[PDB]
């Protein structure tokens, strides 16, 4: 793998020759929805400290 | 005052100054001469009936060389003593424990011309 060019050991994507386009796909789903839920989890506690 | 800030829990040895050697007298006071110079590298040509066939046909000089010499020192010794550029050198240790080198010369030099320049036919 040191004699061949870069395009034999990669695909053109994030996580190219490491992950497999379906584990990359669920990685983007999971990163988006939890960090969006963390935006919900911030302000849903900002009503409990505003109403206690 | 105050004490210094340590961001690690490990103590390692300080990088102290280590001085170079400045002796009051020489190590052995006379440098040795060249242990494996060009007359000691190649000792003697090999003139057996099949070694003589390599001189005529193979463009190869069969030399007996020193047991300490490597292929760089034999490529440099043949070039020094005979002023001949060398293609490749193949060496073996003979079953009487001495070394034999198959020095191949380039195509510019005729090994049979150098063979009777050295003085063996």
């Amino acid at each position: 793998y040191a004699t061949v060019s870069k395009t034999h050991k990669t695909v053109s994507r994030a996580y190219g020759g490491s992950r497999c386009a379906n584990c990359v796909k669920e990685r983007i789903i999971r990163a988006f929805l939890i960090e969006e839920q963390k935006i919900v989890k911030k302000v849903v506690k900002e009503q409990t400290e505003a109403a206690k | 005052k105050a004490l210094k800030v340590r961001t690690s829990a490990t103590f390692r040895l300080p990088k102290t100054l280590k001085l170079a050697r400045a002796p009051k007298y020489a190590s052995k006071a006379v440098p040795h001469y060249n242990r494996l110079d060009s007359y000691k590298v190649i000792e003697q040509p090999i003139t057996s009936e099949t070694a003589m066939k390599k001189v005529e046909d193979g463009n190869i000089l069969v030399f007996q060389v020193s047991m300490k010499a490597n292929k760089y020192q034999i490529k440099k010794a043949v070039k020094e003593l005979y002023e001949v550029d060398v293609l490749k050198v193949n060496t073996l240790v003979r079953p009487n424990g001495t070394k034999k080198a198959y020095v191949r010369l380039t195509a510019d030099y005729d090994a049979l011309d150098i063979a009777n320049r050295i003085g063996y036919i």
Partner: protein
């Protein structure tokens, strides 16, 4: 402001790998550091006898300043000073028919333990400064008591190194004054009165005080809060 955004980190446990803090409290020292620290610690936790405890009853900084100011006036002759005086007296005895006495009588501090102890036994020293730092303390534990026996006033002062500086040694561990110029007899008398008031008058009641037995601050905290939660309700 413009495109630079204040994003604070969350260094609570579970998130956001902790920043580099001062772990000098938790650094695994070399073995000589730990031995030299817990040696002091062990000499504090143990109940010390009163004839060792009298050291760390050291002289106060103002009186120490005055004492080293007086003792700087009688610093002994240095090596180049001895060379210049040896030339200026050897020529004098050889030609000027002197009896090796065209050099005046020196006034200097006396030092070295055998010299100073022999001067105290002869009742010849007028003041004795005693170091508190000496690592075999058996060299100097008899120096208070002997000074109380002989009527020589003595002061335990911080620094064998500071005693060594006044005498051009490295350390000297004791220093004495036996003869003093008459321009300094009053200052020597006031310093001796302060030193008697601090050391020699206090000796026969200091001689009974066992020192040490001082707990560490975790055990100190534990003991005080045990006293404050049990009794004080």
């Amino acid at each position: 402001n413009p495109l630079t955004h204040s994003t604070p980190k969350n260094f609570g446990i579970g998130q956001a790998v902790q920043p580099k803090r001062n772990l000098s409290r938790y650094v695994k020292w070399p073995e000589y550091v730990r031995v030299q620290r817990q040696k002091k610690i062990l000499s504090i936790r143990l109940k010390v006898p009163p004839t060792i405890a009298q050291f760390q009853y050291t002289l106060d900084r103002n009186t120490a300043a005055e004492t080293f100011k007086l003792f700087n006036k009688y610093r002994p002759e240095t090596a180049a000073e001895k060379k210049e005086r040896l030339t200026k007296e050897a020529a004098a005895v050889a030609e000027g028919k002197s009896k090796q006495d065209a050099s005046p009588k020196p006034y200097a501090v006396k030092y070295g333990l055998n010299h100073v102890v022999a001067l105290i036994e002869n009742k010849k020293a007028k003041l004795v400064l005693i170091a508190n730092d000496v690592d075999p303390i058996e060299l100097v534990v008899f120096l208070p008591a002997l000074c109380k026996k002989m009527g020589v006033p003595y002061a335990i002062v911080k620094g064998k190194a500071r005693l060594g500086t006044l005498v051009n040694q490295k350390t000297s561990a004791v220093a004495a004054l036996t003869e003093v110029r008459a321009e300094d007899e009053a200052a020597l008398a006031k310093l001796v009165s302060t030193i008697d008031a601090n050391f020699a008058d206090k000796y026969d009641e200091v001689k009974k005080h066992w020192g040490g037995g001082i707990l560490g601050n975790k055990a100190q905290a534990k003991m005080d809060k045990r006293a404050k939660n049990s009794d004080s309700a």
